[PDB]
Amino acid sequence: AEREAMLAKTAADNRKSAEQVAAAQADYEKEMAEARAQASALRDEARAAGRSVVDEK
Amino acid sequence: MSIFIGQLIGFAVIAFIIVKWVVPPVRTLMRNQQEAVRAALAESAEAAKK
């Protein structure tokens, strides 16, 4: 059985290590996407505020 | 004594036969079994490293 579980974790471990490489990237690109969406929306709001101040003056 | 000598020579002949033709394969099959145990035992360890 010890041999059994060794075989077990072993395989599951290699597959889940590949899955964790994939998960690390995916987490990177999701966090980067969220941050860059925040940046783009902030720049758009800044441009809108600039269009408002231009209208005011 | 004669019976003892004869059966002892027969035992020696069969021992030689098994040592020269039965011992080698059993030995190497076991060798491979253990070698593969080794390989897998390791795998686990390294995959834990990965």
Swiss-Prot record, chain A:
It is found in: Cell membrane. F(1)F(0) ATP synthase produces ATP from ADP in the presence of a proton or sodium gradient. F-type ATPases consist of two structural domains, F(1) containing the extramembraneous catalytic core and F(0) containing the membrane proton channel, linked together by a central stalk and a peripheral stalk. During catalysis, ATP synthesis in the catalytic domain of F(1) is coupled via a rotary mechanism of the central stalk subunits to proton translocation. Component of the F(0) channel, it forms part of the peripheral stalk, linking F(1) to F(0). F-type ATPases have 2 components, F(1) - the catalytic core - and F(0) - the membrane proton channel. F(1) has five subunits: alpha(3), beta(3), gamma(1), delta(1), epsilon(1). F(0) has three main subunits: a(1), b(2) and c(10-14). The alpha and beta chains form an alternating ring which encloses part of the gamma chain. F(1) is attached to F(0) by a central stalk formed by the gamma and epsilon chains, while a peripheral stalk is formed by the delta and b chains. Belongs to the ATPase B chain family. This is ATP synthase subunit b. The chain holds residues 58 to 114 of 170 of the full protein.
UniProtKB/Swiss-Prot annotation, chain B:
It comes from the Bacteria. Signal peptide: none annotated. The chain crosses the membrane at residues 3-23. It is found in: Cell membrane. F(1)F(0) ATP synthase produces ATP from ADP in the presence of a proton or sodium gradient. F-type ATPases consist of two structural domains, F(1) containing the extramembraneous catalytic core and F(0) containing the membrane proton channel, linked together by a central stalk and a peripheral stalk. During catalysis, ATP synthesis in the catalytic domain of F(1) is coupled via a rotary mechanism of the central stalk subunits to proton translocation. This fusion protein includes a component of the F(0) channel (subunit b) and of the F(1) subunit (subunit delta). Two copies of subunit b and one of delta together form the peripheral 'stator' stalk which links F(1) to F(0). In the N-terminal section; belongs to the ATPase B chain family. Binds 2-aminothiazole antibiotics, which are antitubercular agents. F-type ATPases have 2 components, F(1) - the catalytic core - and F(0) - the membrane proton channel. F(1) has five subunits: alpha(3), beta(3), gamma(1), delta(1), epsilon(1). F(0) has three main subunits: a(1), b(2) and c(10-14). The alpha and beta chains form an alternating ring which encloses part of the gamma chain. F(1) is attached to F(0) by a central stalk formed by the gamma and epsilon chains, while a peripheral stalk is formed by the delta and b chains. This is ATP synthase subunit b-delta. The lineage of its organism: Bacteria, Bacillati, Actinomycetota, Actinomycetes, Mycobacteriales. The gene is atpFH.
